[PDB]
Amino acid sequence: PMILGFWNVRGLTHPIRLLLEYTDSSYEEKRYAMGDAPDYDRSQWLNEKFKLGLDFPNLPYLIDGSRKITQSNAIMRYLARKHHLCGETEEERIRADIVENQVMDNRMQLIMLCYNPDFEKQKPEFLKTIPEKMKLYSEFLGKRPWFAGDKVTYVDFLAYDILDQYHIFEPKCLDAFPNLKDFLARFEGLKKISAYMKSSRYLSTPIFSKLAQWSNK
Amino acid sequence: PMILGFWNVRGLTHPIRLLLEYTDSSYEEKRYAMGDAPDYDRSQWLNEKFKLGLDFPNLPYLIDGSRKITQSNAIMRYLARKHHLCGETEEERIRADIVENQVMDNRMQLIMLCYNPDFEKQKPEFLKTIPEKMKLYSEFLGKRPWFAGDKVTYVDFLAYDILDQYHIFEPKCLDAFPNLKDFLARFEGLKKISAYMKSSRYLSTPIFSKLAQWSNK
Ligand SMILES: N[C@@H](CCC(=O)N[C@@H](CS)C(=O)NCC(=O)O)C(=O)O
Ligand SMILES: N[C@@H](CCC(=O)N[C@@H](CS)C(=O)NCC(=O)O)C(=O)O
Structure with missing residues (x-):
C-alpha cells in the first residue's frame, strides 16, 4: 500500500486523508508524535527524516512504490492525476x-x-x-x-x-x-466521506501542533 | 495587450516577467508605487483593488482579454498551458x-x-x-x-x-x-532572456519594499 506520513494531527493533511478515502486507495499511515512543552521533542520524525529517499524531506510525504512525493499540493495533484479529479x-x-x-x-x-x-x-x-x-x-x-x-x-x-x-x-x-x-x-x-467520518481513522482535532495557541491539544 | 499588475519591486513576480519575455508576450505592466513612512501608503492599489473584476483581488494579477487571473502560481500555470511549457x-x-x-x-x-x-x-x-x-x-x-x-x-x-x-x-x-x-x-x-536583462524593463532589485531590511532600497 501507499504510505502517507504526517504528524498526529489534522494540520494541512486533512485534504489528503479524505482523497485517499474518496478514491478507495490502498494505503497505511504513519502518524508521528511530538512531545509536550517546554521542548517539543521531534525525534520520532528526525530519526528517519533523512532515510526515506525523499528529494526534499518534509511532512507530509507519500510513497506509492518507487514514487516518493512531498509538498501537500503535489501529493494532492498526483492523486487527482491518478484518479482523474x-x-x-x-x-x-x-x-x-x-x-x-x-x-x-x-x-x-x-x-x-x-x-x-x-x-x-x-x-x-x-x-x-x-x-x-x-x-x-x-x-x-x-x-x-x-x-x-x-x-x-x-x-x-x-x-x-x-x-x-x-x-x-x-x-x-x-x-x-x-x-x-x-x-x-x-x-x-x-458516500466514502460519510463512511470515513465515522471510522476509527477519522482525525478532526487537534488542528495544530502542541506548539499552537489554539486547537493544540 | 495583456496587463501584469504588481508593486514596483521584485517580490514574487520575477518568474512572471521572465515568462512573458521568453514567450514573446504582448503585455504592459502597471507598477504600483507604495507611499512611505510612517503609514507606507497603498492608496494607488487600494483605490482600484475591488474595481478590476478580480475574483480574489491580489498582486500580482494577469488580465489577458476576458481571462483575469490572481495567484502567482496560477499565473504561471496559465502561461505554461498557453505556450506549451x-x-x-x-x-x-x-x-x-x-x-x-x-x-x-x-x-x-x-x-x-x-x-x-x-x-x-x-x-x-x-x-x-x-x-x-x-x-x-x-x-x-x-x-x-x-x-x-x-x-x-x-x-x-x-x-x-x-x-x-x-x-x-x-x-x-x-x-x-x-x-x-x-x-x-x-x-x-x-535568447530572449539575455536581451531582457539588458533592457529598461528589467528589475532585479529591490526584492521587497522600503519597509523590509534586505533588498529594500
Ligand atoms: N509547503 C509544505 C509545508 C510543510 C510543512 O511545513 N510540514 C510541517 C508541519 S505542517 C513539518 O513539520 N514538516 C516536517 C519537517 O520540517 O521536518 C506543504 O504544503 O506540505
Ligand atoms: N500567494 C500570493 C501572494 C500574494 C501577496 O502576498 N501579495 C502581496 C505582495 S507579495 C500584496 O501586497 N498583495 C496585494 C494585496 O494583498 O492587496 C501569490 O502567490 O500571488
Whole structure:
C-alpha cells in the first residue's frame, strides 16, 4: 500500500486523508508524535527524516512504490492525476489553480495567528477579516455545486477543509453565506466521506501542533 | 495587450516577467508605487483593488482579454498551458509540482527573515542554512539540463528566481554546486532572456519594499 506520513494531527493533511478515502486507495499511515512543552521533542520524525529517499524531506510525504512525493499540493495533484479529479477544460483548470493557491494563503493566515504568543490580543482583529474572506469564496462558487464547475475535483477537498477550519474557529462565519453551508453539507454527503467520518481513522482535532495557541491539544 | 499588475519591486513576480519575455508576450505592466513612512501608503492599489473584476483581488494579477487571473502560481500555470511549457510525462509533472511548491516555501522563508524584528540577532543562523538548501536543489537536478528533465518548463523560471536571490544574499552559497552554477548561466543564456536583462524593463532589485531590511532600497 501507499504510505502517507504526517504528524498526529489534522494540520494541512486533512485534504489528503479524505482523497485517499474518496478514491478507495490502498494505503497505511504513519502518524508521528511530538512531545509536550517546554521542548517539543521531534525525534520520532528526525530519526528517519533523512532515510526515506525523499528529494526534499518534509511532512507530509507519500510513497506509492518507487514514487516518493512531498509538498501537500503535489501529493494532492498526483492523486487527482491518478484518479482523474482534475479540471477538464481550460476554465476548470484556471478555477482549480486559483482556489488551490487561495486556500493556502487563507490556511497560512490562520496558522500565523494560532502560532503567535500574542494570540489573545491579536484574535479580535483577525476575526474582523473573516466576513470578507468568506464573501470571496461565496461569490466565487456562486450557484455551482463544486468549486471548478459541475464536477467534484481535488480542489473541493482543499476548500472543504479550509472552510471547515474557519467554521470551527468562528461558528457564525458562514451564517451570512448559505451556498457555503450548502457546500459543506454536500461534501460530507458523499458516500466514502460519510463512511470515513465515522471510522476509527477519522482525525478532526487537534488542528495544530502542541506548539499552537489554539486547537493544540 | 495583456496587463501584469504588481508593486514596483521584485517580490514574487520575477518568474512572471521572465515568462512573458521568453514567450514573446504582448503585455504592459502597471507598477504600483507604495507611499512611505510612517503609514507606507497603498492608496494607488487600494483605490482600484475591488474595481478590476478580480475574483480574489491580489498582486500580482494577469488580465489577458476576458481571462483575469490572481495567484502567482496560477499565473504561471496559465502561461505554461498557453505556450506549451508543461512537463510531458508523469515523472515530469511530478518533478514540476514538487519544485513549484518547494520554491514558495524557500521563497517565504527568506521573507520571514527580511521583514521581522531582530533580523541581525538572527542574521547568521538562517544564513548557515542556505548551503544545505542548495545541496537539495543540487541533488534534485543532478546532470539534467532542466528541472523536469529534457525541456525548459515554467518551473525553471521559478528555480532560477529562488537560486538567484539566495545567490545575492550568499555570494558563495553556490561555490560547492557546479550544476547550479551551470543552471543559472544557461538560464541567463536563453535568447530572449539575455536581451531582457539588458533592457529598461528589467528589475532585479529591490526584492521587497522600503519597509523590509534586505533588498529594500
Ligand atoms: N509547503 C509544505 C509545508 C510543510 C510543512 O511545513 N510540514 C510541517 C508541519 S505542517 C513539518 O513539520 N514538516 C516536517 C519537517 O520540517 O521536518 C506543504 O504544503 O506540505
Ligand atoms: N500567494 C500570493 C501572494 C500574494 C501577496 O502576498 N501579495 C502581496 C505582495 S507579495 C500584496 O501586497 N498583495 C496585494 C494585496 O494583498 O492587496 C501569490 O502567490 O500571488
